[model samples]
Structures are given as structure tokens and as C-alpha cells.
Target: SHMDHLPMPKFGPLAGLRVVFSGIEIAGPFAGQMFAEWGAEVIWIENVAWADTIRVQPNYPQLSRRNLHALSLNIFKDEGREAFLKLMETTDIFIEASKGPAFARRGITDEVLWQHNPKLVIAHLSGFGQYGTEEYTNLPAYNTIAQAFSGYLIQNGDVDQPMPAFPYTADYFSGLTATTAALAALHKVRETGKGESIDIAMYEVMLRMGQYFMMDYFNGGEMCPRMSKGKDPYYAGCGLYKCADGYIVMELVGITQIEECFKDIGLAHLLGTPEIPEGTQLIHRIECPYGPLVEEKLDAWLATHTIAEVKERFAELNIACAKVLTVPELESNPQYVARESITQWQTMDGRTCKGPNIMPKFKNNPGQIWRGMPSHGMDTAAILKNIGYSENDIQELVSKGLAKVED
Candidate 1:
């Protein structure tokens, strides 16, 4: 069988670890993908009766679900649950996402799983936490809901109404958080031979990410002002600005950066004025006496220069700034090309797809993409074989509709 060719000569730091995650969306499956990239043997479980919605989405499943195995099982049934527990006996980490209490209600609890493998690290992701107020714990939620509940939404967009940070920030952040925490738990498990469970709330992760503003509210009794596009209330010249050809974001936070920017734009004479004092580290557009004048000068200077010219000039001055590159620009970006950040791999059908490469490059035992996304439940028989199930047993499970395998 082609499936026999893998758990393929596992590489990277997580070479010997075994991971299993069951979920339909970004948060849980993405965590599994991260483990797979680091050379863990990751198995993604799907319900035999209902396919994960991600399987139908374009580009997403192809990119985020690569380098893993898939198993379709009806864990709701007694025999199926037993089989799952058997597999868990040999697993190091287990991940899943659902409404609070859903798995426990089905008799799949931490205690039950630990009985099978005492050193397993279980990571559970949810919108709210596993245990919370009854009204919220079981409620359905997505990325935007978590952002709103965590106060992260209020920090973005125009002051009139809170706007969502696009492209599922909460989901992506929660996934990485789970990956980090699970790996830490795995380390502890290896040390003590005790099982552990992690309960991570999506909203809590987003809330932690807003600590900068949360600290202000905690002590100062004030919140960060909702900002408009291309503007920052705290720092001058520290937001997006329009150049002649495109846009660039600047970080003029230090005194030196401000002085250098002014000097290069021929506004050096304004530095000694009372409103634009020589030693001031920051100049607020609304506070300084010549604040508006400084803004006008910088705007005029930027408006006359192209993005390329502005980026080059800023680089020369050691000021921090970057052009707001579009997707097309990023595809051909010199830095991205040089680092091979964007990579291509063939899918199950033999067509190539482009996506980000494995991140945080490892030097000695580097990660590699050995295979693309497998067909749904494609590894069920192979995985059953690994766990000591005979061909007859697998056939019985498949015939009983308790498990599924795809060609």
C-alpha cells in the first residue's frame, strides 16, 4: 500500500511524537497541522457521518491540512469509542474543539482517555472555555464573536463602530496558542509520565493579546481610542501614510527617528522652536504648538515621493518602515523569494498549490512537507493496522458503518 510508505522517515524536533486532533475548522485542525510540520505523526479525525466543513473549502484545507493522516470514525458508538481509545494508548497528544461538555456527554472524558494512556497531553479549544457560565459555555461562536467579547474589536477601525479584524485573527491566534501550550504539556508528560489537559478559550487568547490596552484600562480607567485608517493616536508618524505610488507604514517612536525624519525633509529649522523642543521624544499632532505644521511638512514630503523612494530613504536613515505590499507584490518580493517563504506542493490530484512554507526555520533538523493533503479518511485502514487491528476487524468496522476508508 502507498500508505505504508509513511509515517515517512520523520524529521525535525518532534520526529517521534504522535498527535491526534478531531475538528472541522481552523483552530483545532491548524494546531494538528503545526505538529505535523514539526515531524509529529498527526491524525485528523472526522465523523463518519458528517465531513469536516474545511474539506470543502478551497485553498484552506489544501494548505493547512497537509502532512497529516485522516481517520473517519463514529466515536459516538461503543465499539468505535473503544477503537479510538486503543489508538490514544499510543498517542502523545490529543486535540479537539467543540461546545463545552460535548465530548464528556458522549463518555469521552479526560479520565477515560488517561486510563488508556497515562502520559497523554490533551488540548481542548473553544470560543468560551470548557467550564464557564452555563449560558456562554455551550454557545456557538466564531472569530469575530471572540474578538468582540474580548474587547479586541473596540480597539480597531473608526470610532463610530467597532470593526472586525479581517481573516480570522482569533482563530489563528488560538491555534498557535494551543500548539505552544500542548507542546509544553508534552514536555511535562515526558518528564513525569502524568497525563494533562489544557482548556483554552478563544476569547481569552484575544483578551491576552490586548494587554497593552487592557493595562491602560486597569490602572488609568481609560481605553484606547478607536482609530481611523492610516492613523495612530499615541505616536506621530507611526501609522500608515500615503506615498506617491502606494502606502507605507512608519514607526517614528524614538526622539532620533523624529529628528532624522524632520532633518531629511528640510524641517530642521523647526526643531529648536518652543512648540518643537529639541529634547522632546514625541510630538503629538494635537499637542505640540507647531504640531499641525510638522504634519503638513511630512505629508507634503511623502506625497511627492514614490513608495520605493520613501522606503529606500527610510532604510538609509535607519528608520523603521515598510511598504504595504499587496498579494501580487508579496509573491515577487525579493525577501520572500530569497527566504523561499512561499512554496509549492502537489495535491492529491497532482495539481500544484502555492502557500506559506514551514515557519521559524530549523537549522539542524529542519521540517519538510513530505506529502500533500490526503483524501478524506484515506489512512483509516493503514492507521488501524498500526494500532494492531487485523484486516478482518477493519473490514467489520467498515461494513458496520463504524469506520470509513477512502481509496
Candidate 2:
């Protein structure tokens, strides 16, 4: 079911493009789903024996299996491997994200795969995708681990013990990185009549997200993890403040200068300089010797009022501020509701669910989530049949644990 009741696209832009999704969890699966949302025929491959790791994770099955064809085929087994190789012959792109080195160890490298289809775009995603086998295999590539290892978590909350960001942030960003790379590779393939191998590491994606810190470190040897606490070393007077009802955030707009905003907020007396000169960078560092007076005084003043009152006061003065909102508030917020930011999915089983929608809506060919989530291997037999497998052949594969289906 559509949330905005927007007219469905007559056809997906990526129709006829076949993608083989061998992703296990978040990054890979989300990337494949992104492709599916637009119009690609994404066949999600999984195993029957141990089960895909996501199937056992809470809330993942319903969220992950959407808008794709699910097929069960065990690459570890001989017959399954043969069937998968055969499937690869018909694939335009192949996506795999998991134990990277192990896949290579099993002869699943690009060199080995290029033989199946020379023009296939192969995208491999992991926490540390291009890391050497010993290093990547020894470490965990989970979202939390990637965040922590990339120093993203260390800069998130209190400086004393930085808290992990919402789980959605890391996985989704990594998915975006993977999709961007895959799309670029697809473009390259079209131009050159050649295939590309994209190695996207989730850890590297987080690192890329923290580009300013990296540049700051190399530019002047500073680690910009000065978050948490009222006085951030990175920003001039940007931080969250506690109010009577809840917390609100005040951001000093423009990397150039915002010294006048302090006066507007009645914190002008705390200005460290006659005026924080225009073209100023790193506001907190230059604003004061003992932390910004703007942050301290405004936060103190904000405590006397509700979050709503503070937001209103800041808005009138042209100060950038917002009341910290929870997920529920955001879901019902006027902008999100009007924009149809989140989509609702109604299943054939008389079920309804709502989650994040396809993004970057185009004027003419906007994305549409056309298919509902499928059960494991729900389309296995049909997929095999389309690929030229006989019914008995598919049944034999299922019976031998080389494949599985709803039968």
C-alpha cells in the first residue's frame, strides 16, 4: 500500500537488470533493497542448512525480505555451488557481503567469478572489505564494531564514555556507500563493456563519514572528538541544552561566523572577542578561553523554559534551534507526514507495516516498492524454472539440501 497514494511508476527504470544478492545482513541486504526499490530484479540468495544470519535476528526477516525474489541455494554444497554458478551466467551484477577472506579462500574471488560472466558488476561489502585476510578475518565487521573502530562511537556521546549512535545510522550509511559504488560500476560497465569489482568496507564508510575529523587531524594534528558536555572543542556554541520539559539543540549556523547570534540570544556579554571575526572556523576554540559563554549562558537560560518555549524564542531571533525529537514525534511530524518520508507496506497475508521509504524521489521516475517481503525461498522453484531448471531438477536440489523451498 502506498502512503502518499502517489501514482505508481509505469515501469521501474532498472527493469531487466538482474542482480544476485548474496548478502547476509544489513549493509549488503540494504544495498540490494535500494536497487530493488527502483526496479532491478534482485534475487536474494540464501542457504537452507544454517540459515541466513538475518533470519534469526529480531525484526530483520520482515524488514529485509522486501521487494526481492528469495531463493535458497547452499554454495557450500557441490550441487548448490553448481546451481549458483549457473545462475551467475544470467546475472548482470553480483553482490556479496560477509566473511570476505573466507569467500576468497573458497575460490570466490573476482578472478574466479569473471569466468562465469565477464561483464558482471561484482560488489563485495564488509566491515573491513579490503583488509588483508589475517586482519579482516581476526576482527569483527559488525555495525557497532565498525563504529567503534572508526572512532565514530568515541565521538558520539559523553567524552568520558562515548555512546554508540543509533544502529540505523551506520548500516544505512554503509548501504548508501555500497549502492553508490555499485551504481558507478554499472555505469562503467555500460560505457566500457567491462565488469567492475567494488570493495566497500563498512568501517571505511564510517571513516569517510568522519571526513572533517580526519582532515582536521592531518591538517593540524587534532582529533575532533570534542562532543558531549556543553563545551565542544569542535563547534563554537553548538550543543544540546536541557530544558524544563526536555532537551533542545542549538546550532550556530555557518562555518564562517555566528558571533552576532549570541547577542540575539542575550548571551552577548559572554563574547570572548569584540566580535568573533568573520571567516572564523572552529567556533568553540576561538569563542572563549574557558568554553563558550554563549553555550553556557544560553543553556542556563534555556533550563528555565520548556523545550517548546526555547525553540520558539530561538526561532524568532533567527537562531538555529530545535527541540530534540524521538522517533514517534518524527513519524508524525508535519513535514515527514506531508513529504511521505516513511512508507507503509501491506502484505498479502493481511499484514501492515511502516518503515523508511525509498529516497531521492525523482520528478518523472520516482522509486516504488512494488513487492511485499517474501518468506525464505518463497520464489526458489520459480526462479530456478526461469533459469532453465526442470521441476525435477529443482526438487532434487531441494531434497538434497542444495536448495530449499516452501514445498
Candidate 3:
């Protein structure tokens, strides 16, 4: 039923483009999801013997399945490997989440694939660049390690407290970069009929994401201290404050805005003058010992108003603020509803789950998410058949545990 609401393009931009996904799960699958949303016929080559490591992960079923078609293939098996290579003969794009050298060892390297299809777009993703000789590169690194090593963790939490690792920050960025690089290369291929290889390091991208902090350190010579709860020069009236219903965060960065916020919140007496210089001084004072006094008053005032009421009142005064939303609140928010940010899909078992829709809308060819996540090996037979395998050949492979057909 949810899929019915999706606005499928009348003429899909990538209707016949073939994309093959292999290697690690999250980043590779996410990249495939983006391509599939844009109308690529993406085939996820799954290793059934190693399926539990990816497919049966905790909470896998809650996401949509339609963006990828899953097929089973054992790289170790000659027949299965042959079937995969045959698929590559006609594939337009090959995406892998394994480290570069490992992909080469497995015979899925760009140089090898290019020999078969000179116009193939090969996208590689890993925690480190393939050429790096670092010890960290030899060992597997996940999202937390990427963020920790990239300086994100040190600058994220309060100044006094070290922040915990943010899960999937690197993986998500890596997926985004892979998809973007693939699309750009596809454009180039369309123009010149030349294939290209893209090397994306998750840790490198994560580090790039912290460019602001890096610039602060290098250019401004300011060491990014951990943010204290109520400390920071970026916002005078920013940080989480307890409200009657829940927590609310109010940010006032502009000089005019800060004055207006203090005036509307009945803190004008605390601010001696309405001028910019006086406003700055008042803000500095507020950041000092006056912070506790203001908090005490605001806490009392906030106790008398619900989060919704506070938001409305702040809105009326042209102040910037918002309630710290919970998951349920996010689902029901009017803005989120209007933007259709959250999409739902129905499972075969008559269940519904939520996921994010295609963001950053396209005017001419908007993307769509159609399918839910596939059942394991749901497209093995069809894939092998498309790759030139006969029904009997497919059955033999299945019987030998080299592949599996969907029930």
C-alpha cells in the first residue's frame, strides 16, 4: 500500500542500466539503494555462505527492500564465479565495499573487470585508501573508529567530556560519496564512452566532513575544545533547556535576533541597552555567572508552558527555537509530513516499517523508492538466467550449494 503512493517516473532515467553490488553490506547496499532509486536495475550479489554476516544482521527487516534485487553467488565456486563474470560482461556499473587490494585478490579488481567491459564504472569503498600502508588499514575499521580517528569524536561533545563514537557517520558518508562518484562517472561515460575507477575511503570522507574543525585548528589557530553544555561562541542563546513537557533548544546567533529573543522572553531588563555593543556585553554576561540566573528564571517560565506552547510563543516573537523531538514527535511533525521525509513500506508478512525518502528533490527527474528489502537470494535464478545460464545450469549450481533460488 505504501509503495502505491510512490510517484514512479513515467520514463525512468536509468531504466536499463545494470548495477552490481558485492562485498560489505551497509555502505554497498546504501549506494545500491541510491542507484536503484534513480531507476538502475541493481543486482545485489550475495554470498549465501556469508549471508548471516550481512543479511541476518540485527534489525535488518525494518527497512525497505525494493531498491535492490538480491542473488546468491559463491565466489569460491567455479560455476558461481563464472556466472558472476558473465553478468559483468553486460553490467554498466560495479560497486564494491571491500578494501581495494582484497577486491583485486578476489579477481573483481577494476583492471580485471575493465578487460571484460571497457566501459564499466567501478566504484570502490573502504576505510582507508588502497595505497595506504597504515596498520589501521590492515585491520577492519567501522564507523566509530573512523570518527574517532578523524577528529570528529574529540570535537563533538562538551569541552570537559569526550564524546562517544557516532555510529555510521563514516559509512553513510562513504555511501553518499560512492553514489555521487558513480553518477559523475556515468555522465562522463555517456559523453566519452570511457570507464573510470573511483576510490572512496570512509575515513577520508569522514575527515572531510569535519573541514570546519580542521580549518579552525589550522587557519584560526583555535583548538576545538569539547563543547561545554552551555558554552560556545557560535550561539549566545543556544543549548538545550528543560521545558514543561520536554527539552527545548533555542539558538540566537545574529545580533538583532539575540536582542529580539531577550526582549520577547521578558529578559530585556537583563540586557541594559538595545544597541549591538550593549547586546554583545549582555550576551557575554549571560554566558558568565548570569547564565545560571537566567536559566533559573527561564526554567520557572518554561515550567508554565508546554513545548508546543513555547514553540508557538517563540514563533510569534520571531525567535528561533525548537523542541528536542523524540522519535514519535518526528513522525507526526507537520513539516516532516508536508515534506514527505518519512516513507513506509509493507512487508510480505503484513507489516509496515518506516524509512527516509529520496532527499534533495530533482525538478525534472525526481527519484523514487519502490521496493522493500529483498528476501535472501530472491533473484538468484533470474539473475543467472539473465547472465546466460540455462534453467538446468542454475539448478545444478543451486544443488551444489554454490547458489540458491528464491522459494
lDDT of each candidate versus the true structure: 0.85, 0.74, 0.71
Q: Which stretches in model 3 have alpha-carbon errors above 4 Å?
A: 1-12, 57-64, 165-167, 230-233, 263-305
Can you write out model 1's per-residue Cα lDDT over 27-105, one digit (the tens) per residue?
A: 8888878988988889999988778889788788888888888899887786788899998988999998887767887
lDDT computed for candidate 3: 0.71
Instruction: Give the per-residue lDDT of model 3 (tens digit) for 1-407.
Output: 23211233342577767888886557767786677777878887778665625656645634524577888788546887777777777888988877545777666667777878888999888777676785655556477777887877677777567774555667777888898899899999998988999888887887888887578788867765555564453434567777788988876555556566666567777665442346462344333555655555666777788988889877866667877788887878888899999877775456676777676677677777666677778888767766667889988998888997786
Each candidate structure's TM-score, on Cα atoms with residue i matched to residue i, is 0.94, 0.87, 0.85
Q: Write down the worst ten-residue block by lDDT for model 1.
A: 1-10
Model 2 bad stretches (over 4 Å) = 1-10, 57-60, 130-133, 230-232, 253-287, 290-292
lDDT top scorer: 1
Q: Which of the two candidates, 1 or 3, achieves a greater lDDT against the reference?
A: 1
Highest TM-score scorer: 1
Q: For each candidate, C-alpha RMSD in Å?
A: 2.4, 4.8, 4.7
Worst 10 residues of 2 by lDDT: 1-10
lDDT of 2: 0.74
RMSD in Å for model 2: 4.8
Candidate 3 to native Cα RMSD, angstroms: 4.7
